[model samples]
Target: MENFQKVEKIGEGTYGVVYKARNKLTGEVVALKKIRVPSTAIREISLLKELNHPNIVKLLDVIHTENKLYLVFEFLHQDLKKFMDASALTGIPLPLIKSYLFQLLQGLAFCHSHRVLHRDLKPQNLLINTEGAIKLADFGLARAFHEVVTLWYRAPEILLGCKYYSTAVDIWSLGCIFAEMVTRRALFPGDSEIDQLFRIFRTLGTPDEVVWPGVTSMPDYKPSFPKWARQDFSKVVPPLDEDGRSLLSQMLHYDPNKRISAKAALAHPFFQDVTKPVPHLRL
Candidate 1:
């Protein structure tokens, strides 16, 4: 308990409070998150202990006191949300965007391969350093404990009450975030639940049996109105190159089966020039 000194508040965490702290012994900086036990404490600690990768926020240690728990993690400069806000005036650079998304997928690919679904993936949960490096933060429990995942970046299937949703649910947010990198605005911004889904269908075209087989079977599925045509993604991200648009279209697919896998997307032509594989990535 006396090993490290808490510096300042980090932000509101899913569990409890988070802080910037310094280790007295090694003089290393770390993030200390204080959370109460059971529920969140159970999944977060168990899962993070198994997740050891450069692109993931490393869980350094855990301390327990009665029913409360404290998690120590590697410190990251800030999250992508803040980065995007800082760069809003001049847009995130294409090369940097490619580099960042590459790392983002790297983390997601690793998590998915290990049978872990990082159910909460949004600008807030993705950490980015000063050097354009990205790391996935906050698993927020196996989706087993979510009061519910955030709606804006949520996959359409999850919204439809499909409990069998897989890692592809996370891919849905990947597509949304990819667009945000260029547009500096959420691709589907809505005020409420109905508005959110409607906003998605209105742009991506109403879900049909062809693009999304068994679309009518979902609990929340509603019959389409106006029979909207598939949108031209190039217009949505006009600044993106041909390959960028192509890869994004696959990520944003209406069906989970149609969405691009994180592993495959890593090799997509879109990222060939920007960054090397994990071994070579730097801060």
Candidate 2:
């Protein structure tokens, strides 16, 4: 605490508030996250310690007091949520979105490689520096498999309360953000649990045992509902090219097992023609 000076209130999340700060010794800028939940703090610390990748936010230090847990991170200060919603940009360039998605997958691939699942992969949780590099942040909801990762960007299997699931859950979240990037809106913006499920089913179409194999076996599964058919995504997300739409479908597949892995998503044909934009200067 004595070595770092708190600068300003930067942002807030489910677990706690975050602050921009400056280290006195080397004058390095950083962010301080204050987390109160012991479980979440422990989870973030454990996962971030072993994880190291350019596309992931770097955890610099941890400060644990009697009541509050503060985790320090190297600051980039360019949250994708703000970057995407900038008034000047109006809309992010297509090439930029492609690169952002690519970096997202690369980071996720690294997490999956170590058997870690992000659980949340939305624009708000991603930090982007001026260099056109997007890094995954907000690990409060992330833990090993079989842990609750929250909903919204959460997968269909999770909405059904499926206790047994895999990394495919994260893939579904990636798809949700990917779709949002095209239209500047959440693909499935749901207000409640049922609303969330309805939003997803309406877009991807209601799943069945025939397609999903064991969807009925999920703990909260209920058979009867108004069935919705999958819509033509190109019409919904017009900015995406044919290849981009194809890749989006793979990530948003109704069947969790059928969803594409992050590693494979990186090589998808959608990125073949993604012309890299000029990287922005680091602040």
Candidate 3:
């Protein structure tokens, strides 16, 4: 931690508090994350070792002391959550939203193609550079998935508690993220895990043996009422413009099999107005 000149404490992160710092040698600004060496440190280190992408925060260097590990990374000015909240208060323009979402999808597609699952894919997990280029950050909960990932961002099979899973979990998270980006609000604003599931069921409708076969065989499967209930999404997401609403529906599909992949999502009409090559703007 002492290697760099500490500028200020940025904020609390999943593992530890992050700090803005200056590299003494090259005079470069960076975010320094100090993580306690938990029993799971080995797993975290192993996973980060394999993740290498422009869209993902680079693991620049690791400083190992006797009792702790400090992860060094390039500094980012703002996170998506902070940016979105501020934008809402300032009345963000639709074109800006489209640009941000396109960059986000591009970043996600890169991560998915590399077989990495950002288990916690939320607004907070996304960082924006000075030019508005979106980069996925905070890999503490991220895992290299040959199969599925987290329950919160998971697809129907994993949400229904399947043992086997895959990159589709990230796709589901992208769906949730897409909705939040458009509305500037959380799609499944569940107070608890069960409530979260209910929110998902309410918006996208519940999964069944036909759409999600073997749902009943899952370890956590429990049949809840009301059966055949059709939730009016318009009630939850009030007055979403046609394009915004359609993108949400496609991304947040009930069946994981039906959810749009990162590649396909980029080609959606929602991004029609975004310039080609997806302009890499600083935040």
TM-score of each: 0.89, 0.90, 0.83
Which lDDT tens digits does candidate 3 get at residues 133-202? Answer: 7788876454421222224454656656766676667777777766666666776676556666776776
Alpha-carbon RMSD of each model: 3.6, 3.4, 4.5
Whole-model lDDT, model 2: 0.79
Instruction: Sort the candidates on TM-score, descending order.
Output: 2, 1, 3
After superposing candidate 2 on the true structure, give the runs of residues whose Cα lies further than 4 Å from its correct spot: 37-44, 87-89, 144-151, 279-283
The Cα local distance difference test for each model comes to 0.81, 0.79, 0.69
lDDT of 2 at 51: 82
Q: Write the per-residue lDDT of candidate 1 for residues 194-272, one digit (tens) a residue.
A: 7788788888988889999988899988765447676788778878889999999999998899899999999899987
| Model 2 agreement with the true structure over 177-274: per-residue lDDT tens digits | 88777888778877788989998888777888777888877887787867898778877788778998999989988788888999999899898876
Please identify model 3 stretches exceeding 4 Å from their true place: 37-50, 144-158, 232-241, 276-283
What is the lDDT ranking, best to worst?
1, 2, 3
User: What is the Cα-based TM-score of model 3?
Assistant: 0.83
